[model samples]
Target: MGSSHHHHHHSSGLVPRGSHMGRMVNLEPDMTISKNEMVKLLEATQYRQVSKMTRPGEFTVQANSIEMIRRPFDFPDSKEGQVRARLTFDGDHLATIVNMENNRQFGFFRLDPR
Candidate 1:
């Protein structure tokens, strides 16, 4: 249970490699997550284990909830995974963003496209 997987580079010809597009915010329920934003998250995080997410940064997406550990407790000791956010989606539409660890509603993201 200690293997790490590297995320493959997806060259969709939309954004070049190593391109910093924009910023992200605290996601919440009933929020709208754009298509590009979702792709960005999938590309940035190296979440190998989809289910039973034990490691930090690992994520799992079901029909209702999108579970992810933003702050991991390994290696760099960052606060990214320490604050886990459970994003609830209603058929691709973001509905809520709750802190999985504390079970509290933080906020949602404000994605401003170019």
Candidate 2:
């Protein structure tokens, strides 16, 4: 059954790139995701954090999440896909994470102490 016309299943890990308007996966509040884990998730989703103009272009995940402002992430070379999220910490643990974009609450997740 070695047919040369076998359908070539595209195994590339790359996701379809287009307007992700309704395809965004928003994290819910009270969800448990570590800082490092969240960073990886965002990066994996083809999102890069919008850095400040004043700061040097040094990409560091640990220092980035410590800021208390709503952080925006978008496609590296384009502005088509834009999303923002705010993280609140309870001492050393994360307290809450809220998706802030399009005037909608996409995700409202809480920290998991585990």
Candidate 3:
């Protein structure tokens, strides 16, 4: 009789700094988007998609086709101690990125553009 051995490999998520594995992008002001597209993108970079975005690292799609980021992003001057990204749409156009904490819209893009 012969014994068989198996090996498994795990990845450290290490890759070139410029690689898309952890790459970030900026959304232009006149960008257009589709339903569930923004939320799907966050699911890839930030975290998983949830039925309801009520916690950090979670996102959800609204009945109105809006995508909300439940995560409270840290910023240099975050009055609410956290920030949220609310992506609104007009038909198929990106209306704006609203800061849920203050209901103000922001034009800055990139999950973590360094």
Candidate 4:
């Protein structure tokens, strides 16, 4: 529970090492994320997750009504688990055990290309 993991690039060359290409947000060390911006980013990831798992023609999202935390978290060293960075998002922090899931999925659109 205390181990950390590193991320790598894709074989298609769509994302590069140490690059923000194909992430949820183009957040870098120099970027400043405000509270509202955090909420927006969280909601975007949430909506995408829901739409991917929910029933057909039932997609919907507007605002992130839930409390959100944006930070870097640990990940596994696997193929599907390969990530760009340790970036993370937390929702329902104070909820039950069911709320403590690894909802760590990056956006494929935020990739930085040369």
Candidate 5:
């Protein structure tokens, strides 16, 4: 994620980056979002991140009207810690559970880009 960096992606993360700079990724602020989208996404994701500190469930990720496809595999490396997921998100209106443990990661499905 543009919101997260590789610093915490030891095992594996959605936006896992092994580069020295970290998750060398970018959010299409201009494509799917407005100029204020940065602020919106930043604030929203930040709020979600803060809540995670307490091991709380952040807001559910609502899939857009369209769904995305993704192939599953182990996150070979992560700065945060070990990572694994038995279920993957196909991207939908339903909300999946999010939690953190032992510096580990687990998420349902992938919300692919258009």
Candidate 6:
């Protein structure tokens, strides 16, 4: 002789929670800056040109605290072509680094006081 047993299952009812909402703020400047000022600020930093011909773009200053370094040979079509890097400043401090070609980001840095 053999004995058999059966079990019943039950489901739990639960409601999912919603996500939280937060405000977005932007404190960066929107006005344009002078080329001379950009050059001066760049020079004040520890960054130096590796070669004699390597130089920043003609329109280096993107905004009040944003600067771009584009070499002469940077082309959009080629792998090595594109913006060398983007430099962001907080007052006189170099705060961020962004690479245009590879879409990579570097750590933050500070500039020396004049």
**Clash count in backbone of candidate 6:** 0
Which candidate's lDDT is highest?
A: 1
Of the pair 2 and 5, which is ahead by TM-score? 2
Candidate 4, residues 1-98, lDDT tens digits: the string is 65444343222432234344334553332222333554564454443223322222122232322222233243466222212232322232111111
For each candidate, the alpha-carbon lDDT, in order, equals 0.49, 0.39, 0.48, 0.31, 0.28, 0.38
Model 3: lDDT to the true structure: 0.48
Q: Any residue pairs clashing in model 3, and if so which?
A: none
Per-model TM-score on C-alpha atoms: 0.45, 0.32, 0.45, 0.22, 0.19, 0.32
Q: Write the per-residue lDDT of candidate 3 for residues 10-55, one digit (tens) a residue.
A: 2223212323333254332244555565555555546555676655
Candidate 6 — which residues are off by over 4 angstroms? Answer: 1-39, 42-59, 70-82, 107-114
RMSD of each: 15.5, 15.1, 18.0, 14.4, 15.9, 21.4
Model 6 Cα RMSD, Å?
21.4
Candidate 6, position 94, lDDT: 35
Clashing pairs for model 6 are none
Model 5 alpha-carbon miss at residue 7, Å: 28
Score candidate 1 by TM-score against the native: 0.45
Number of the candidate with higher TM-score, 2 or 4: 2
Tens digits of lDDT, candidate 2, 1-114:
676653433222222342234315443223334556546644654444556321222122333242223334446785433343455444433445444444234332333454
Regions of candidate 5 where Cα sits further than 4 Å from its true position: 1-92, 102-106
Q: Give one digit per residue, the lDDT tens place, for model 1 in 29-74.
A: 3244544445454454444337665456567655345676654455
Model 5 lDDT at residue 21: 38
- Model 5: lDDT of residue 44: 42
Q: Write the per-residue lDDT of candidate 6 for residues 1-114, one digit (tens) a residue.
A: 455342221111111221112112111112122434445644543234343212443224444334445443545685443355555554533345445455344433433344
